[PDB]
Design a binder for this molecule. Structure first.
Ligand SMILES: NC(=O)c1ccc[n+]([C@@H]2O[C@H](COP(=O)([O-])OP(=O)(O)OC[C@H]3O[C@@H](n4cnc5c(N)ncnc54)[C@H](OP(=O)(O)O)[C@@H]3O)[C@@H](O)[C@H]2O)c1
Ligand SMILES: O=C(O)Cn1ccc(=O)n(Cc2nc3cc(Cl)ccc3s2)c1=O
Length: 315
């Protein structure tokens, strides 16, 4: 299928467009091209500082009668500096206003960690440590629940939560909505078998981010492993007469995951969509999973001491 069923009864397209690091100057066109070749899910975030430009793309294609809103699946994320209960609605309404939407299909707690509230997205002390806020996961969740109850969002979830932090919400006394989705880093070098096992066994859909290894991540090192340049994957792709990326995208799809590859390059936006016309074999799958090195690209070492930092646990 092209969409997966969420616990709120809605269907989420398994392929969406990533927008982290998509420059404002270029993401409007990115989103317009994506919608034209068939993407219906867009992954956004206030912290990406481009939601206005996404918004412009979406409104235009609506008005062009290319798509209707009910066909779109728009995701955004509550940033760490807005975890306080009194800050959540405003944060959501800023995103809705930027995107020019009257609701979000899915809204996620971006990271489990709260940061000191203020203008700066990554507030630092004088020694380079990120300054936390005195917020906890459960209170933030209750604020997320309100947004559903108020019709601002159809569904809520989490992102970058380890299985203990997921359990905390699941077991929350007086829980109103279970998380629909957990959006985590996932690719052949970080295959997340245990967390995916956990999440799926709980009826929680897993979305795979940085499926191509985020080669444009601002802290990349030349010596870092590169999925897109991996000769082993290239060979699997050539066998299927597909590109390396196409394979890297088809891989999470065959694990019953949602996947959200990012591009602002029109030809790669279309390339990345052409993944519904082939299947990776059982061996292929097995082979890609064996490349796991539990290697992640998205972490924040300056925040490792946070009580809620997620990657100290095994999964
Ligand atoms: N929840 C979170 O904490 C979190 C964290 C990280 C990412 N995510 C989400 O996941 C999305 C995807 O992850 P990502 O942006 O980190 O990286 P990604 O999708 O793994 O890779 C994006 C990089 O790959 C390039 N690229 C795209 N298609 C290509 C192709 N067919 N061939 C060769 N290169 C290609 C892009 O180049 P161009 O764009 O220049 O073409 C860009 O430099 C993000 O944009 C964001 O929406 C969520
Ligand atoms: O947030 C995004 O979607 C993209 N993104 C942007 C900047 C960046 O440094 N990172 C790494 C982070 N790691 C943590 C780790 C934790 Cl515990 C909290 C926040 C972050 S941010 C990043 O993933």
């Amino acid at each position: 299928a092209s969409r997966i069923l969420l616990n709120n009864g809605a269907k989420m397209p398994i392929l969406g467009l990533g927008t982290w690091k998509s420059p404002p100057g270029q993401v409007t066109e990115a989103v317009k091209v994506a919608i034209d070749v068939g993407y219906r899910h867009i992954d956004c975030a206030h912290v990406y500082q481009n939601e206005n430009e996404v918004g412009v793309a979406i409104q235009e294609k609506l008005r062009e009668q290319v798509v209707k809103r009910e066909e779109l699946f728009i995701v955004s994320k509550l940033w760490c500096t807005y975890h306080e209960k009194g800050l959540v609605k405003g944060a959501c309404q800023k995103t809705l206003s930027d995107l020019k939407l009257d609701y979000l299909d899915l809204y996620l707690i971006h990271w489990p960690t709260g940061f000191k509230p203020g203008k700066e997205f990554f507030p630092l002390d004088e020694s380079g440590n990120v300054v936390p806020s005195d917020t906890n996961i459960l209170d933030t969740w209750a604020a997320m629940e309100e947004l559903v109850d108020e019709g601002l969002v159809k569904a809520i979830g989490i992102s970058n939560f380890n299985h203990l932090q997921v359990e905390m919400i699941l077991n929350k006394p007086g829980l109103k909505y279970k998380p629909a989705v957990n959006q985590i880093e996932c690719h052949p070098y970080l295959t997340q078998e245990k967390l995916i096992q956990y999440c799926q066994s709980k009826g929680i859909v897993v979305t795979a981010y940085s499926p191509l290894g985020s080669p444009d991540r601002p802290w990349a090192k030349p010596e870092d492993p590169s999925l897109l340049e991996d000769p082993r994957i290239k060979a699997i792709a050539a066998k299927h007469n597909k590109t390396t990326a196409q394979v890297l995208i088809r891989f999470p799809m065959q694990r019953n995951l949602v996947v959200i590859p990012k591009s602002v390059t029109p030809e790669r936006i279309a390339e990345n969509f052409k993944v519904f016309d082939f299947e990776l074999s059982s061996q292929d799958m097995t082979t890609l999973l064996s490349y796991n090195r539990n290697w992640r690209v998205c972490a924040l070492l300056s925040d490792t001491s946070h009580k809620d930092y997620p990657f100290h646990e095994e999964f």
